[PDB]
């Protein structure tokens, strides 16, 4: 099986693009969204100014997002640091994601949002991107410390607009008493937010990803009018104060599992997210899931599918 962490999906006219945490973050295609061979990594090496944001910075880039505008490929990631908030998320642009392209290169725009220790109670790790019906687009983003938000980018989708406009979208118990530099128990992170019929939805994952049996990382929902909040949960409690439903746990097989991405194609809706294996040493593996929604607007999975979903890395 394909392993992947944080992974996001795009599609360039009859081909899929997926992408995952991993150096310069790793790039696999596939014609058919299950038989996936490698194609590139987005940096060669690293971002010019990743060591600068994180002295430690071990050539992994976390936490990816491809977004579509005006025909460019805009590719968001962080560069950060383990239990820190030295943190950035920047982004690059190519013209076309098919390596044999002559059009193909990735060009660096930089640093769209940075988070600063004692400065900032946020982390500024976990893009993704959202477009709304009066032309605007935002990032959402963010893990522990004070949650997760959501602000309005600029016209080149690059930098927060000026004047700047933040909205909080989801946050859990934390006292401003404790020390800035630490993470805290607010265990949230990754948002992604999917358009579906009169509602935004607001995906999270809740819990501890990267820890081998331990793990309780799962995903949570909620969904709101407007794509800046609040997004509440189906008992009608606001994500801002620890709201959120249970979407898809884990089980014997699949100790836990999330960072979770959910798009549209040919009329039918898919859940992307990565599940670690208990039987493969918790390796983290690829998970397509179809996703449904009942009579009541909510999102719905069948868990049955971390088992029939197999992905298979070509070479």
């Known amino acids: 099986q394909v392993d992947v962490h944080d992974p996001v999906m795009t599609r360039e006219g009859d081909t899929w693009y997926l992408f995952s945490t991993g150096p310069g973050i790793t790039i696999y295609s596939s014609?058919?969204?299950?038989?996936?061979?490698?194609?590139?990594?987005a940096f060669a090496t690293e971002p010019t100014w990743?060591?600068?944001?994180?002295?430690?910075?071990?050539?992994?880039?976390?936490?990816?997002?491809?977004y579509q505008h005006k025909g460019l490929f805009?590719?968001?990631?962080?560069?950060?640091?383990?239990?820190?908030?030295?943190?950035?998320?920047?982004?690059?642009?190519?013209?076309?994601?098919?390596?044999?392209?002559?059009?193909?290169?990735?060009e660096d725009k930089g640093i769209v949002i940075e988070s600063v220790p004692q400065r900032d109670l946020w982390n500024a790790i976990d893009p993704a991107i959202i477009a709304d019906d009066h032309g605007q687009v935002w990032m959402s983003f963010g893990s522990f410390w004070g949650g997760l938000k959501l602000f309005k980018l600029n016209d080149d989708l690059?930098?927060?607009?000026?004047?700047?406009?933040?909205?909080?979208?989801?946050?859990?118990?934390?006292?401003?008493?404790?020390?800035?530099?630490?993470?805290?128990?607010a265990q949230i992170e990754a948002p992604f937010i999917l358009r579906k019929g009169d509602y935004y939805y607001l995906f999270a994952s809740w819990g501890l990803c990267c820890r081998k049996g331990d793990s309780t990382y799962?995903?949570?929902?909620?969904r709101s009018?407007?794509?800046?909040?609040p997004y509440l949960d189906k008992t009608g409690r606001d994500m801002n104060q620890g709201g959120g439903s249970l979407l898809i746990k884990g089980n014997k097989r699949w100790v836990?599992?999330?960072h979770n991405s959910a798009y549209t194609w040919d009329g039918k809706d898919y859940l992307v997210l990565h599940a670690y294996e208990a039987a493969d040493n918790y390796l983290?593996?690829?998970?397509?899931?179809?996703?449904?929604?009942?009579?009541?607007?909510w999102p719905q999975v069948d868990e049955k599918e971390l088992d029939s979903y197999i992905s298979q890395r070509l070479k």
């Open 225 to 229: 009018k407007q794509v800046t909040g």
């Open 31 to 41: 014609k058919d969204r299950v038989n996936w061979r490698y194609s590139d990594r």
């Open 158 to 185: 690059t930098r927060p607009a000026e004047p700047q406009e933040w909205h909080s979208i989801a946050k859990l118990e934390r006292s401003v008493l404790m020390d800035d530099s630490q993470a805290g128990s």
């Open 218 to 222: 799962h995903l949570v929902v909620g």
């Open 50 to 66: 990743a060591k600068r944001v994180s002295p430690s910075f071990d050539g992994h880039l976390w936490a990816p997002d491809i």
């Open 284 to 297: 983290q593996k690829l998970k397509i899931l179809n996703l449904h929604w009942d009579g009541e607007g």
């Open 256 to 258: 836990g599992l999330g």
């Open 74 to 106: 805009y590719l968001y990631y962080s560069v950060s640091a383990f239990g820190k908030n030295t943190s950035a998320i920047g982004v690059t642009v190519n013209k076309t994601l098919n390596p044999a392209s002559p059009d193909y290169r990735w």
